[PDB]
Amino acid sequence: AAGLGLEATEHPLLATATELPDGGYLFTGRLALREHPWLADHTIAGTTIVPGTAFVELALHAADIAGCDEITELVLHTPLVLSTQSSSLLQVAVGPADPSGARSLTIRSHGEDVRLWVEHADGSIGPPPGGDAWDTAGLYARLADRGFQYGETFRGLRAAWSSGEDIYADVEVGAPASSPKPEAFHVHPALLDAALHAALGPLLDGEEGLFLPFALRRVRVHHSGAKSLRVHITPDGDKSVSLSAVDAAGNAVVSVGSVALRPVSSAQLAAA
Amino acid sequence: AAGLGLEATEHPLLATATELPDGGYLFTGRLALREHPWLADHTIAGTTIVPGTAFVELALHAADIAGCDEITELVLHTPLVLSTQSSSLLQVAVGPADPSGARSLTIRSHGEDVRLWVEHADGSIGPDAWDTAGLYARLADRGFQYGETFRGLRAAWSSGEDIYADVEVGAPASSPKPEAFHVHPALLDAALHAALGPLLDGGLFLPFALRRVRVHHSGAKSLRVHITPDGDKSVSLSAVDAAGNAVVSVGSVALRPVSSAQLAAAA
């Protein structure tokens, strides 16, 4: 990294971080399924793709290095498809600060011997009683039948109850010995994704096909490295939920103003 | 480079090139005297510093990658001091294009385990026979300690206010080949050694500002150079290669005094 004229960063998905003269930042890394076999456990209708929560994690790292408290808003566009035969240059770009302190943010990649960048995300950064217990293995079976083919690392929903319109979930990182440890991330993408698996129950209930995250608002992490979470999920309008989470000692870890889901065609994914 | 998530570039002083989402570019490289011993031959008053013409070269590479014909203006500020015990992260940043196609350019560095960037240059890009060994001896006595790679002025004549110079890269096997550069910094710098002659008769003088640098063919191995005055301590120049093809021209080069104390401060 120094050998190429750049400053290193410590993160499981990014190798470099540099502040540019205009006050913006660039982060870069190599993304290959062979170096990150845990990502193989996030497969949707036959296609292995970087989860939305991983793009969230990347933005959290940028937020942290640039001094911002919040991902204000993030929207996902074209997916990033991983396979064992391929590998991608991955980049996060952050603009300079507004007078209010807000910065644009973008995440993009391209195949190792391909020229054209593909934009996967953009957005901005700146300033339990009497509830019916769920059969979570049963939830994962039904999700699998719809195309959510979560391998061991992404089957992190251990337990769940609902009361009224709300859901409470215990999540943990599935198959620990098979990812980088959750202590190495702002929030392990499998942990945060497993927190959404519960929400998929009611949200898919009388629905045809697949629904994935496409937009998040007000993501604020208060402590990095949580290994597990107790999660309060509440509805937020149609196909949206919000959530709030403490760790096993009750310290507040992360909150999400809003996560919006949308229908995706499996054929679009096979194409990407 | 690919291993860190970046696109490589082929250049002797830069390892990477990336286009940023805003249409700007970033180039990076590591700069260590131990990997580039030819740069030890550019020493001024005891302090080894990257020559002005190397900053010009860096801009030329940026210009080329970004589709600009010309360095419109370039100004040097703090020098970049090299030593055998040190190494610098080097960075060239280019802004997005104007409607006219003009882009800002900045060059900066910082020591490998130091936090603060130092800006070395900024600007914009867009659309009678002489005894030369005698010249070098006098220049050495004043503090211009050019080693072999930078003693590239082979011959020179003046007529009227104008100067004509044959330059080559000194000690070729000890720098990267001139083919690998837009214009080998030693070649271009030797072209200025001649202009130091008349100037230093009326301390130490280095380039501080350049205007309208356009290269017409990259990779020249030697040059015949026409130098003309352009106001006081400024010259302009024009250069063809050994076959008479036009290689490079410079609207203006301004020189300024530098004190060994300023150099110690930069170190």
Describe this structure in words.
The structure is a homodimer. The first copy, chain A, has four helices and 16 strands. With 272 residues, chain A is an alpha+beta fold. Chain A has two domains: 2-126, Roll (Thiol Ester Dehydrase, Chain A), CATH 3.10.129.110; 134-267, Thiol Ester Dehydrase, Chain A (Roll), CATH 3.10.129.120. Chain A has a 13-stranded antiparallel beta sheet with strand order 1-2-6-7-8-5-13-16-15-14-12-11-9. In chain A, strands 4-3-10 form a three-stranded antiparallel beta sheet. The radius of gyration of chain A is 18 Å and the shape is globular. The interface between A and B is medium-sized, with 31 and 31 residues. It is classed as lyase.
Number of helices of chain A: 4
Instruction: Give me the count of strands of chain A.
Output: 16
Question: Based on CA inertia axes, which overall geometry of chain A fits?
Answer: globular
What is the name of the CATH topology of the largest domain in chain A? Thiol Ester Dehydrase, Chain A
The CATH architecture term of the largest domain in chain A is Roll
Which CATH first-tier class of the largest domain in chain A would you pick? Answer: Alpha Beta
Portion of residues in beta strands of chain A equals 35-45%
**Structural Rg of chain A:** 18 Å
PDB class: lyase
Keywords: Double hot dog fold, Polyketide synthase, Dehydratase, Cremimycin biosynthesis, lyase
Assembly: dimeric
Entry title: Crystal structure of fusion DH domain
Key traits:
16 strands; 13-stranded antiparallel β-sheet; globular; three-stranded antiparallel β-sheet; 2 domains; Thiol Ester Dehydrase, Chain A; homodimer; 272 residues; alpha+beta
